[PDB]
Each structure stands twice: as C-alpha cells, then as structure tokens.
Amino acid sequence: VPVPTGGDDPTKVAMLGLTFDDVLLLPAASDVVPATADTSSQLTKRIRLRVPLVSSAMDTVTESRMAIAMARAGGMGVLHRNLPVAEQAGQVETVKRSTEQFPLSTKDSDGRLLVGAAVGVGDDAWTRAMTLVDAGVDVLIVDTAHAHNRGVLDMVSRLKQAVGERVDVVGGNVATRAAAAALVEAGADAVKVGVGPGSICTTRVVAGVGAPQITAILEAVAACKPYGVPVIADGGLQYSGDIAKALAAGASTAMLGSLLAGTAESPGELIFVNGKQFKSYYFQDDVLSEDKLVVPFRGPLGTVIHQLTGGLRAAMGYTGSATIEQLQQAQFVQITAAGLK
Amino acid sequence: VPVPTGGDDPTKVAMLGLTFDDVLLLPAASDVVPATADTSSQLTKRIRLRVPLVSSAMDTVTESRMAIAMARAGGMGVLHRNLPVAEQAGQVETVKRSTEQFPLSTKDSDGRLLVGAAVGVGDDAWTRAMTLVDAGVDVLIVDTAHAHNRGVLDMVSRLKQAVGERVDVVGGNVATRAAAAALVEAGADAVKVGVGPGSICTTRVVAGVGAPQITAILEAVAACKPYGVPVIADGGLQYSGDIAKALAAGASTAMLGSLLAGTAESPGELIFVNGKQFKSYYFQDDVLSEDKLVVPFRGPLGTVIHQLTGGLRAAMGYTGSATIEQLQQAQFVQITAAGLK
Amino acid sequence: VPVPTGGDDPTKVAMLGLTFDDVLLLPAASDVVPATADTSSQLTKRIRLRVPLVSSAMDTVTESRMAIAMARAGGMGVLHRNLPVAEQAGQVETVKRSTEQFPLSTKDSDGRLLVGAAVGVGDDAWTRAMTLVDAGVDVLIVDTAHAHNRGVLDMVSRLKQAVGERVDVVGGNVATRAAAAALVEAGADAVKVGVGPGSICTTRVVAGVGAPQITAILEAVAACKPYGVPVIADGGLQYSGDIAKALAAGASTAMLGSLLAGTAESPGELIFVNGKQFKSYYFQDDVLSEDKLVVPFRGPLGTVIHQLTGGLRAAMGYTGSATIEQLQQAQFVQITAAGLK
Amino acid sequence: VPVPTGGDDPTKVAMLGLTFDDVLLLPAASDVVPATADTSSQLTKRIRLRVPLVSSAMDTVTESRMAIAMARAGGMGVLHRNLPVAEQAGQVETVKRSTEQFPLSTKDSDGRLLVGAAVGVGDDAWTRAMTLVDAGVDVLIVDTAHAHNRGVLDMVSRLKQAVGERVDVVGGNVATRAAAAALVEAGADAVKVGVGPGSICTTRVVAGVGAPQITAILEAVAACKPYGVPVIADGGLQYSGDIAKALAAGASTAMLGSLLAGTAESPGELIFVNGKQFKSYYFQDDVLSEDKLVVPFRGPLGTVIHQLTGGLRAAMGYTGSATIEQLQQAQFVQITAAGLK
Amino acid sequence: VPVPTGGDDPTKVAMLGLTFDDVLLLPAASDVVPATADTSSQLTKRIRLRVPLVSSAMDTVTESRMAIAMARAGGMGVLHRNLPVAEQAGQVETVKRSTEQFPLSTKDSDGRLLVGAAVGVGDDAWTRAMTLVDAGVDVLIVDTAHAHNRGVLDMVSRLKQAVGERVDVVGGNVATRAAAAALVEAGADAVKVGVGPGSICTTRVVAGVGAPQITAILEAVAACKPYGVPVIADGGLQYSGDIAKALAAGASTAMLGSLLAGTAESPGELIFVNGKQFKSYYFQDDVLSEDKLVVPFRGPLGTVIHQLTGGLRAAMGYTGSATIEQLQQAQFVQITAAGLK
C-alpha cells in the first residue's frame, strides 16, 4: 500500500523527468550523408522553414537587424515586446521592407521576409496585436510565462477568430500534456514548450516550479501530434546536440535564445572593456515572468547557424534520418550519472 | 498508459546504458594465481593473440615502429590510413621486413610479424585495399565512424569474397545489436564496437549521438557470439580495470588508442617545452568522423603494456578465470552514484 | 685609481642607461592648447609626416592594407621583407595605386600614397631593392638587427649612390653614437635606433646584449643632429607617454610595432577561439635577428592612432611645445625606484 | 663633455626626483609630548587653520555636507566646480548659513564657517567667480591641471585686482620653482603644488608628464618662502606619515582627496553590494584634466581626521617640533629600494 | 669627513657590487658572423678548450658519464670528491679509458680525454690527490668554500711542488683581489671565482657573506691578468647571456653547475613521479660550505651545450669579437631598476 517514495497517493510524484543530459541518440541504419540531409521543418501549420531555428523574442536577442539576419539564414526572428507599440510596429516594417547571397531566405508570396512578434495579455495587448497585424506581421506569439491560464486561452481564441486568415497564432509556454491540449483546443497553430527548463533557472530556485525539457516535449507532442500542431522546443538548449535531441523528441522547431544573445546582429553597442569585447545597453506586465521574481561578444550569426546546422546534419546522418519528420522517430538511450563526468 | 519518462511509446527510450564506471567485477570461486593466467584471446576467427591489446589505427598512435613494438609485445598494431597509399604499403612492408627477447611475438606461417591496415569506403578505398593486400598485409579494417551504412557492408562483402583466403576483414564501429548482426551477415571476421563511447566525446556534445560502452558490448555480443565472431572493444578505456570489464562483458580484444598516443613508439619527435617533454609533428575523408565536427610524453610502451597485463591478470585471479573465454562469463555488480565520488 | 664597481679600468662600465620608465617630462611655461599643436615631423631629410608614427615592417604588422591605413592616418607604413621579391613589389604597387575622409594623407607630388619597404644585405637584397625601386617605392629600409657591420654600411652607400635622388635610404638599428655617425657618413637619410630595448627582450636573455632606449636615442641624436639626419626610435614603446618621451629625447619619429600587431588592418583572418578573438595565418636570412636566438585582437587602427596622438598632444600642451622641434628641447626628471611601485 | 646618462647636455635630465617613499623623517632633540603639539598652520597669508587639511574639490569628494564637516573638524573644504554656477553658489550659501562639540571650528569675522570654491579659466569662469564672491565665499581656487599657462596667471591677476580685499586667491597646480615664482609674481596668496604625483597617475602613463612630490614641494617652497606665500601639497598622500613628510618639506597645508573620498560626508548614497558597502552617484573645460585622457565606504570623517592628526602629532613629537613652523625645518634621510620590500 | 652612508670611516663600505642583472653588453663595430666565431679559450695556462664550459664537480652534476659527455662536447668535466678515494680514482680511470661523431673532444698528448678531479684540505686530501695523479687525472681542484685561508695556500703550494709538471693545480673560490693575488703567488694555474654568488644563496642569508659576481670577476681579473693566470667564473649563471657577460668581464671559462644538474648524463636514475620526469638519488669536511650552514629532467646535454654556444656566438657577433680574448675587452652598460620589470 505505501508508496516507495512516501505517502499513500501514488500520483503525488507524477513522473520521472528527463533533461537533455539524460539521453543520447542511438545510431540506426543510415543511407544519408550530412551534406544532403533536408533540415526543413514546419514552424506552424502553414509555414515551413529551411532551418528549424527561431530567435527567442528577448530584448537582448531579437530586434529588426537580428530578425532580418535570422530570416535570411533560413529560420525566423520573433521581435520582442519590451517596447512601445509604435516602436515594435516600426521594427516589423523595417524587417518587412527588404539573391545568390541568401538563397535560403524564408519569404511569403509577395517575396518579403517573414517575421513574428510577441504580444502579451490584455486590452493593450489586443491593440498592440492589431497594430502589428496591420503593420504586416506574419506570426503572433502570445508570450506568457504560464499559458495554462484562462486569460491566455481566451486571447489566443480571440486572435485566431479575428485575424486568423491573415496571421498565425502560437500559444505560450506550457510543459504538460493537458496544457498543450488546452492550447490546441483554443485554436493555436503552434505550441511553445518549456517552463523553467534550465538546471538552475530562477523559476526553479525562487518558485520551486519547473519541468525537465525532454519529458515536457514528449508530453506536449503526445497531445499536439494527432492534430497536426507543431511543437516548438524553447529554453534549456546549450549545444547542437541538444537541438538534435529536442527535434528527435518530437519538436518541430527550436527557439535558440542564449546562443544568439551575444552575436553581432543582436541588439546593443559594441565596446571594449579590459581588452575584451562586450555589448552594452514598464511593458513587462507578466506577473509570473522570471524578472518579476528576482553581454560578451560571440561573433557573426552566420558561423553560429552554420555550426548548429552542421551538428544537426551529423545527428541526422548518424540516425539515418533524411528529413526532420524521420528524425522525430529516432530512439533514445538513457545514461546514468557516470556518463556525465 | 503513460510512460514514467513521458510520452506514450514505451520504446522511445530504448534502454538504460551502462558505462565502465557503473559496473564492477564480482569476486568468485578462484583457484588461479595471476602469474599462470592464460591471457590468450581471439582477434579474428583465424587469428589468436597472446596479449589481447591492439593499437587503434590513429595517426598519432600507430606507424611501422608502433606496429612492430605491439606485435613483439604479444598483440598487434593496425596502421592508420591518413597517408598516401604508397606510404601505407611501404609501412606494411617495413613491418613485414623484420627470440629470447620477444618470445610472445605474433607471427604468420612464415614467421613474419603480423600487421593490420585500415581502409575506407569507395573505389579509392578498393585500390588502397588491393595495394595493401599485395604488400602482404594480414588484417584489413574497414574503419568507419558509423558502420551500419549499406556501402560499408557492400565494401566488407566485396573484400571478404575477393581476398577471403588471403586476409581477414573486420567491420567498422557499431553500437547496437542490429548493426553487429548486419556486419556478421556481411561476412566480417570480427566486429569493432563503439560510437562516442567517451563521457565528453565530441560526438555526444555536437551531434548528440552516443552509446555507453558496456551496454553496446553486451548488445553486439548478443549478436556475434552465436556465430563465433570475435568482438573488439574500441574507445572509452582509461585503466586496466576498464580493459578487464570490457573483456568480461563479452569482448575478445581491447583496442587501446589514447593509452599509447604519448608513448615513445608512437609517431612524433620528442622535444622539451617549459621543462616537460612533448611530441611534435586529403585522406581523412570520413563524412561522420569526429574531425569533421570539431601530445605529451608517456614513456616506453613496455611498461604500459606490462601494467595493463598485470591488471588483467589480477582481475582474472579475482574472478577465478583461467582463460579469457572464462573471464567472459564473469558477473557484474552495479554501483550507484555515491560509489563514484 | 680603483673603480668603485671593480677593476682598474674606469671605462669598463661605459655609462648608466635610462629607459622609458626612468624619466618623466617636466612641465614648463606653456601657451599651447593640445588641440592646436602641430605634430608634424621629419621622417627623413626630405619627407615630412603629419603624424610621427611609422609601422615596424614586421610580418605580422604591415602589409598593403596596413600600409594604406597608415598612410591615410597621417603616417607611413613599411612593408615587411619576409616575402618573395615579386610579392613585395606587388604589395608596393598595390599601395601606390590608389578627400574629407583622409585630409591627413601622406602623398607625393603625384597624389599617390607613400610606402616603404625593408631590404636585407647581399646580391639577393640588391636585386630586391632594385625591383622595389622599379615598382615606385619611396623609402628603402635596410632592416638589420645590427647596423654597425661593414656590409650594412656598404649596402647603404651603394643604394644612396644608385637611387639616391629617387628614393630615401634608411640605416638599420643602432644603439651608440659611433654607429650613428658611421651610418650618417655612409649616406643614410635617416637613422633607426634600438637594439634589445625591451626589459625582457630575447637579445638580453640569450645574447646578453642590449641598450636602454632613452640613452640610445640621446647618444644617436648627439651624432645625427649636427647633420640634420632624423632619428627613428624603434622598439620599447608601450604607451603614448613612451612616444612623448622618445620624441622629447631627440627622435623625430617613433616606430610602433607591437602596438599594431593585433589591430584590424594587420594581416591575418579574424577568428574565434575559446570565446576570444585571435588572428590566423627562407627569407629570414638575418644572422643576428631575434628569431635565430629563440596574435590576439586589438580593434581598429583609427582608435589606436587617436589615443596615441591625444597622448602626444597632451604632452605637448604640458611642456609648452607648439611643434615637435620644440618638444625635442624639453627636459627630463629622473625618478627613483619608489616611483614605479 | 659626455654626460653619464647620454648626450652632451648635462641639463637634459634636470634633476633627480624624490617621492614620499624615498625619504623618512630623522629623529632629533625633542621635549614635546604629542598631546601638546600645535598643529595650526597658515592656509593663506590671511587665513590660519587649526588642522592643516583641505578637501580636494572633486565631484566625488567635496560638497556642502563635506565642506561643513571639514570646517567643523578644524580644516576647510573646497567646493568642486562640476556644477552650474547657481548650484555652487547655493552650496556656498548653505555652508555659510550655519560649542563644546566642535572647539576647533574655523570661522570668519562674522562667526560663520569658512568655505572655498574652485573656478576654471575663461569668461564663464569669471562670471562664476563673481557669483560665488557674491555668495559669500572666502577662498577662490583657480583649479587647473597646469598653472604655468599665461591665461591662468592673467585670471589670477584679474581676480586679485577685483576681489583682493575680500577673498583670497590660490594659484593652480605647479611642479617647478619657475611656475611658483610666476604665480607669486601674478599676486597669488597661496600656491598649490603637484602635477601627476601618483605612481600610476594617468598623466604619467598617457602624457609622460609628471614630477615627484617631495622634490616639487621643495622647489616650490624655495620660491614661495622668501615672499611669505604658503604652499599646499595636493595628491600622492596615502597615510599620515605622507602628510607629515609633505609638511616637513616646507608645505603649510595638505590636500587629502582620496583619503576623504570614502567617508560618509562625501557625496553618494551608501548601499550594500556583494557583502561590502559602496557609494552610488559641459563645465569640464580644463584642457589638460585627467578625464580628457582616460566608491567604497570608510566611515565618519571625524575618526579619519583624528587618525591623521594623531600621526602628525606623533611625527612632531619624534622630530621635536613644537609648531608646524618648526616641523618645516626637519631633516630627511633617503632610503634605498631595499627598505621598501 | 662624515660618510654619506654613516660613520667616519670611508672604507667601511668597500665598493658597490654589480651582479649579472645589472649590466648589459654594448653593441660595437662588428665584422664577425656567429657561425665563424672562435669560442676557444684557456682553461689553465697549459690547457685550451674549444668550448669554455666546465661542470661544477658536484655530486649531482659530474660523474664519469657526465665527464665523458662534457669532454666530447669540447669542454671538460671535473669529478666530485664526495666519494671514497678508490671510487673517485676508478671513475677517473673510466673517463681516461676511452671520430667524426665528436670532432671537438678535448684530448691530451696521447689522444685520451681530459678529466678533472676536486680535492679538499688535509692529509686525506693529500693521499686522495696522490691517488688521482697516479690514476692519470689532468687537473686538480682545491675545492674550498673560502680559499684565502693559509691551509688552502699551503695545499696548493705542496701540489704545485710535487706534481707541477704532470698536472695543473687550480685554487678554490675567491671573491677579492687580495685572495686572487695570494693564490697566484701560491702557484695556481687558474683561479676559481665566487663566494655566495646566488641572489638568495644560503651563504648570504645564514652567514651574511657574499660578493656580486661581476665585481668579483673584475677584481680577480685585475690581479690574475698581468701574470697570465686564467679566471674561472663559478656560480650565478642562469642563461647564456650570463655566460657571455662573465666572459666579457675578464673570465676565461665558466663553470656551469645547476644548468647541467638535470640533464641525461648527470647522476641519478630517471623515473616518473605524478606523470612528471625526475631523477633519483663523512667526506664533506668543508666547515664553511653551504652544507654545514643549512631533480627535474632537462634532456640531453648536447642541446644544452648547443644553445649556450649559440648564445655565446650571438654575443660575440654583436660585440664584434672574433675570439674570446677580444670578447674580454667588451664594455658594459649599467641598467637601473626599471630594466628588470
């Protein structure tokens, strides 16, 4: 009768959570060379990217220059919302208002670059979303720290019903199967996954709330896959191997973030301190955001994207996956604590 | 229905992988003293060694001098292939052109020292293999980073059918049971095991692909033992205890590699920098090699081989194994994380 | 009769040597503001630079790009001679074949940029010098580690007699009054000063030969001033104050070297290693060069030249010198050991 | 004829310079107990302080609070001029608009506290000086980096002629006898001494200009003493022994600066960062100021002044000087570099 | 009359001593290429070496193997006396009982190698000296810590009287002109110079006795040069520059010691400790030796001697010295404290 970990309720400890360091990709029968692997993936139900990488809509990562650089590399940039509405709309216009140099560009029918923007929850969020839609945006991200709230679902449904034909809607951060199912029922075209995914993230330390990323992705995919809704792996990524693992768990796209924070195309001013290069620099109304609880130079973005895509191509070659849809069926091997030393 | 680690498919996480640090050899009834232990082992179905150790065909490890020294010590050296075909054939001939000093020498019917050579995949690989066979090479290694490819199996089958009576063919690196079975069916005389076997290997960090070595050896043995095909452990070894564990898990020979890189017989000139000695110095076309993703001094080879043999003999004495074929029937005990600190 | 430092020879220890850290510039009666001081100086008896800074003709410092940048900044670059003769002549032509962006450009009668080139000693050196002169070069530097040799003086005399009217000949490194007088008599248009001027230079540690830079400049100037020959202070500089002291000691132009090794315009590709920027890359026939005895990033060159010129202008304002020819009449104060701690 | 340090001019290195670390005070015949020593000394020819310490007129050191505290403790504060004229005049008024707690207070004829204000050079400097005179200031400091400029002397003469009968005029920073003589000829009532007195002062590193403080004070006193003009030592002081040495070289008052920066009476709000206490915070027209080239907490001001006065009293007792006028005749002993380790 | 450094006797502080770090060799007129520099020098009045280097007769430096290696390299080794007399005589015979490989070997009339041996003071020293002479030794060293004693002079006179024709006698360590003159009068064929020449030598710390090496050499040469007696510099050498400086001050041969302690030919067995290379190891009657007051690996001796000779040749080329006799006329420049940072 007693549970081995204590108590009488077997469901008090729901499940054992796996992170990126707990699993490795098993080699399989392969007829694919890395140079010919097709790394194209679905961002939403209507948009296909050439490189499954998306910027993280942070104020230190994505602006108009970063969005253009990401869109020309085959991915997409999502503009942050720590700005006045007019500033974000102007950044959207700057991205939109722009070929052997960048054949891999992601473009709509009109030939303009694709860009997304983040909107919060509320009436100001509604007017900001409408202004961004009229400015020519393509994807609307409902950037929330916890997307299982009723207000977030109401906003997602309202956006999908009002401007559903013009633009796509992406749900906020979730980490369970039930939350992903709720977002799918609300009408979202894509689901962003991750709630305190880092090992020592501030959400885990201060609030004591978190979810290991591999298990969270597998749970969200278990709810999103039958309906054709893509899953975006957000947070916790540290290497190209982590990106390959996230894509192999069922996610269709990876939101990079800290990898692109210190690149040249990121916002900030380049200065020299102690012989080392650095980048120097009200609307964050989210109650559960991390900043409500509590940069070094990395070079050009092209080399970073090249390294990440090379690692992903190597993983595809090892696992015998010619497409991302075939990489999503790859198997894992769980490693013990001795495998991390 | 829910899996304890997330998702619905119980085969998404195939198995838990054990490394060399997760297991220890259990003592058993013993009547064997370390000095009379029989350390002879099979390298292939037609070749038997006196010390089950082989150099790992790396450009910093094995050349003609290293091959001669390793064959005179009771094992065998495998010449690397980062060289023009003429140079590799010349080194093969130099090894062939050579008793109280070296009683344990491994020799063919003519009394000449045994040597192996690594080849690649393709038509250039075919002409290199034919040139090496003409020069009197004894073992051909189809050395690939991921040997479960179809072209690798075709190359192995062609070599086995053409020069089956002349030389023995050994398949590339594998990590699963299916790959080992495929290599056995292809006609290989021995199977080399290991894909990213190190804890911080570059294959794991960049590509996210790997396999713990103990589990990989147990899986490849489960496919190779019914046909009598020897299994060669490759990579992940750090001590003589790791060699004993690999031989007890089912492998018939351990491939040393980094344990011999800094020794005197390895290629490189001995120089002095900052008061310590160091060693100073087109054909690396493997698509999945670790080089595509990304040496100090160690003293004489004789002391290293003597220490490894002493450790193996101590393990044989502890486990009551008179021969390696009995050491392969030993039992493991699995230790927790606290046993590593 | 006995000398306090030992022996009976009062001239055994010739003199005490002062370095850049031993002296400071004394403030004097001033009516000069830093921003209106004239930093023009004579590089040779016929060439006048706008900023008295010249690159040091090292293989990691000055090539065509660096020479163009230096000539546009107001000084002059000297091309290194670690190249085949044809390549050096091609770089000379590249610099020669080229205004509110660069008002301070150093240009000849034809409006083309000035460039210098280094030559050695010998028949190969003679043919290299003739090839460079045929390419339109302006200043020929006899780059030798010790210019008091007879061969260097003979080469200088030959060049002055052959192409004296077209180009200017500059003698090699000297550190005494006698060598400076010998170079002046041989026919040099400018005398370069410094032999192991650094504190831990390889010449001092290995060969035991050296000369502090302030004393060396004062001695060479005592020989070169009566004949109007400018003195080029080469080596030992680490700050703009060092440049100010060198110009106040009597030198007319400073040769920079290590301060420009890792700048943008120096040769080499800008690469990233370990999260930090670095630069990636038969003719070293000098018998007495430092090479026979035994780079990181710095930023754009414009900021370096701005900082150095600002330091020199501040020094000119402090000492009350409206011209470099007036700065050469400044006085020093010698500081003790406690002034360095 | 040749000079031992190089050249033929014996006055190129004018003199050897001594800092505070190069000298120590020699004990002499004494009959003065520390508790009865008189520490009163002239600040100007008309104002006599009871404690010979003055704050250094910097934006991080002296404001109205600091000036009031210094005047209460027995010295005087000089208000910095990095302010609009109205703000500085208001601070002067605040200090003026203000007894067994502060027996040593320095007061004017009307019984108000004494305060000084620093002015620059120019017409704006003239209007600022006149506005501060109308505010009730007592001492006008012509704060410059190099006071041998003609404009500084002209400004001093103008101020002396205009407001001579009301307030006192103090000349800027000097480091030579000639500059002090020029200031005295201009009509200054006190001469401030020091041009880059620190070992690692930015003026020495960037401009190469400086003068050791002991020699500078001895030279300026050699000119100011025959005319009865006091000498103020500014910069380079780090202990009470340094204050004693400065006063013994002939100076009548020491300007502290960094020794008063970390006190609570200095501007800046006190907070706690990383377990340690710290302080938080157009008119900079001085062409040679340090800011044109390129804080911790220490407690109450009274304890710092007590410690410094105790050290000075101990020095007076050791040297047998009943008054400061007797301490200024004390002798020094010069120590070698071996006494600093 | 009062001395600047205290007292009334001007001869209390005899002289200012210079070490190797206080002087540098001034460049002079040169016509010597380092490849043709003649490094031949006198060891005694009847022995001329081809390389002026001698081992220091310490138990950790020189034995039979080291002596043979040094004699074949162009110099000479001196066997240490920390052994039984029979063992030392046997080692002398071993060296004696022995050519394109070693063209520069130092040889006697019969063509055998030259060796040296050290003796103490006393009757045991006399019997040891007689045994060594009967064993064919060529040079006898009266190895004492202080050679101005009457016993040392008596021993030298006795040896020169008894075996003057067959072998040469060398006096112990001296550091003054008077001691050198006394040894020369006693009849020594060479004078060894240095009494606590190290910077932190145990003699300087425990006994407080020592003399800087450059001054000591200049003083001993002042007494030895008129009579044609060579001077040997002992101790204090750390680099080839120090060797060049010692030979320039007037010494004819340098005794290496610590530079040859960790080589291959020095006594001590080669082993590995913590992954690092190391060496493993009643007659000490010297009362004033450092022993009464109180190794790592270096590689083959050939490279060490080659580097030292290369540095010496570089110094000879810089100073224009065709021979060592001409190098002894070179001049020094004295550097201040700032020349060592």
Author numbering:
A (entry chain E), B (entry chain F), C (entry chain A), D (entry chain D), E (entry chain B): 12 to 109, 223 to 405, 428 to 440, 448 to 494
Can you list sentences taken from the study reporting this PDB entry?
The only extended MsmIMPDH structure was obtained from samples containing ATP in combination with the substrate IMP. Three distinct classes were refined: extended, compressed, and intermediate. The compressed structure closely resembled the compressed forms of apo and ATP-bound MsmIMPDH. The IMP molecule was only partially present, represented by weak densities observed for its phosphate and sugar moieties. In all our compressed structures, the Cys-loop, containing the catalytic Cys325 residue, adopted the inactive open conformation, but in the extended form, the active closed conformation prevailed, correlating with the presence of IMP.
Central to the purine metabolic pathway is inosine-5′-monophosphate dehydrogenase (IMPDH; EC 1.1.1.205), a rate-limiting enzyme catalyzing the NAD+-dependent oxidation of inosine-5′-monophosphate (IMP) to xanthosine 5′-monophosphate (XMP). Most of the IMPDHs share a conserved two-domain architecture consisting of a catalytic domain and a smaller regulatory cystathionine β-synthase (CBS) domain (also known as the Bateman module). The CBS domain serves as an allosteric regulatory module responding to the binding of nucleotide effectors.
